[PDB]
């Protein structure tokens, strides 16, 4: 396919969500209009979408949590959606706020997602209120052939409540805008959260390999007392007939766990030629009591954005927990910088869990990565400011007055050097561009007997010796 088929809807949604429910709504749409809706669930659709979106294998509509949609907008991959005020009043104002980017709506919200603590009531009538009291619990449970707690370690969505509990954050939220120069991935509290998790692994209470489906199997087969997961999971648990509760997440250092809250949302592809059909599907078929029930029946959405349908669902205690955990947490930012933050934290947790890096090492890399935008400007500007002084002083100092050869004034890339006489070894303090450079130590540059700067014997390149700058640590 060179282009997206005009006159059908192709829809993309994650494989843990109610995709067969959605296809049912799609079947009703085809009954009324005559146009086929195809629902799909590719792997890593959130990563595939930018690459394929305008290509012709791209979907007409994409479902994902709201955090990825700012980056999608910046890349111009999404249509602006145009619901009138009457439709807007059908959803809660806070949900519309998650899908607003630079003043425009960029997706239709569907549901508010937050992880909760799930537990096996038969094994555990009384769930722990606190993370610190878990290892104790796992010791008892191992004696009885069980594990206390198994959940996805591979994805940082699941480990972020712990990290944020004692003071970790993504980007500082001041003035009603997120400040990307200030990142809370390497602070005291984050270090503390991740350390607790790594210690659970050192003391055998969890296994670093644990991923989404291992942990699901363990809970649903009654091998583990507890799990951490969202409303989508509840279907498969029902099926198993494990007797289960959904409750508040455990406190760490007396502060509650703070999940990042996702608003599952639907965007329309900018390259779709079926945009009004898409709008009609989403507004008149999907976001209805009828429609959301088809989806929630297959796999639960949690707390929905549609006020009418949330009023059916609000009596359910699993929803109340979900909202309680949401309230303790934070609504995700949608800025483009979120893709970098998740990569950072994902990478850190895996490396540390895995044994590859200490916690302080793993996280310092996350801070470097999560805040790449800002650190490139500063690093870059340090250097440029030095270049310009060099250039000014190269223009200002009068000509060499010396009857012999001399190497002339130059900017070497890191430091300024003056006209220097033949056979003279010139020196000055190391620059402070890099964290491993001691500016009490010095740099040499030798001018040869013929008035030419020293060249490296490895490649005859003009070269100043910065070896003392970082040689002692």
């Amino acid at each position: 396919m060179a282009k997206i088929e005009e006159g059908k809807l192709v829809i993309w949604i994650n494989g843990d969500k109610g995709y067969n429910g959605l296809a049912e709504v799609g079947k009703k749409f085809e009954k009324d209009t005559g146009i086929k809706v195809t629902v799909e669930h590719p792997d890593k659709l959130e990563e595939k979408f930018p690459q394929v979106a305008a290509t012709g294998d791209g979907p007409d509509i994409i479902f994902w949590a709201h955090d990825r949609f700012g980056g999608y907008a910046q890349s111009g991959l999404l249509a602006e959606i145009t619901p009138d005020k009457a439709f807007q009043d059908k959803l809660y104002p806070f949900t519309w706020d998650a899908v607003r980017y630079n003043g425009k709506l960029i997706a239709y919200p569907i549901a508010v997602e937050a992880l909760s603590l799930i537990y096996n009531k038969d094994l555990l009538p009384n769930p722990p209120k606190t993370w610190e009291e878990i290892p104790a619990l796992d010791k008892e449970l191992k004696a009885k052939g069980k594990s206390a707690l198994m959940f996805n370690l591979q994805e940082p969505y699941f480990t972020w409540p712990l990290i944020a509990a004692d003071g970790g954050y993504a980007f500082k939220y001041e003035n009603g805008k997120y400040d990307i120069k200030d990142v809370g991935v390497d602070n005291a509290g984050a270090k503390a959260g991740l350390t607790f998790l790594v210690d659970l692994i050192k003391n055998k209470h969890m296994n670093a390999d644990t991923d989404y489906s291992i942990a699901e199997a363990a809970f649903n087969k009654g091998e583990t007392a507890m799990t951490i997961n969202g409303p989508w999971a509840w279907s498969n648990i029902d099926t198993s007939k494990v007797n289960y509760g959904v409750t508040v997440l455990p406190t760490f250092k007396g502060q509650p766990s703070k999940p990042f809250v996702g608003v599952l949302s639907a965007g329309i592809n900018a390259a779709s030629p079926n945009k009004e059909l898409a709008k009609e599907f989403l507004e008149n078929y999907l976001l209805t009591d009828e429609g959301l029930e088809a989806v929630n029946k297959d796999k639960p959405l949690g707390a929905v954005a549609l006020k009418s349908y949330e009023e059916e669902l609000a009596k359910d205690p699993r929803i109340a927990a979900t909202m309680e955990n949401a309230q303790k947490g934070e609504i995700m930012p949608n800025i483009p910088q979120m893709s970098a933050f998740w990569y950072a934290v994902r990478t850190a947790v895996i490396n540390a869990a895995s044994g590859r890096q200490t916690v302080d090492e793993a996280l310092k890399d996350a801070q470097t990565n999560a805040a790449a935008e800002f650190l490139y400007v500063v690093g870059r500007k340090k250097m440029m400011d030095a270049q310009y002084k060099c250039y000014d002083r190269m223009q200002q100092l009068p000509a060499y007055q010396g009857e012999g050869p001399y190497c002339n004034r130059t900017w070497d890339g890191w430091l300024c050097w003056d006209d220097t006489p033949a056979g003279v070894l010139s020196y000055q303090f190391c620059p402070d561009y890099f964290p491993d450079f001691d500016p009490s130590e010095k740099v040499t540059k030798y001018c040869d007997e013929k008035g030419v700067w020293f060249k490296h014997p490895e490649n005859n390149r003009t070269w100043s010796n910065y070896t003392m700058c970082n040689a002692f640590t």
Binding site: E361, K364, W414, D436, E458, W463, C469
Partner: peptide, 11 residues
């Protein structure tokens, strides 16, 4: 702590 290089090919 990634280690800064000072060899030929730097300044």
């Amino acid at each position: 702590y990634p280690r800064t290089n000072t060899g030929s090919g730097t300044p």
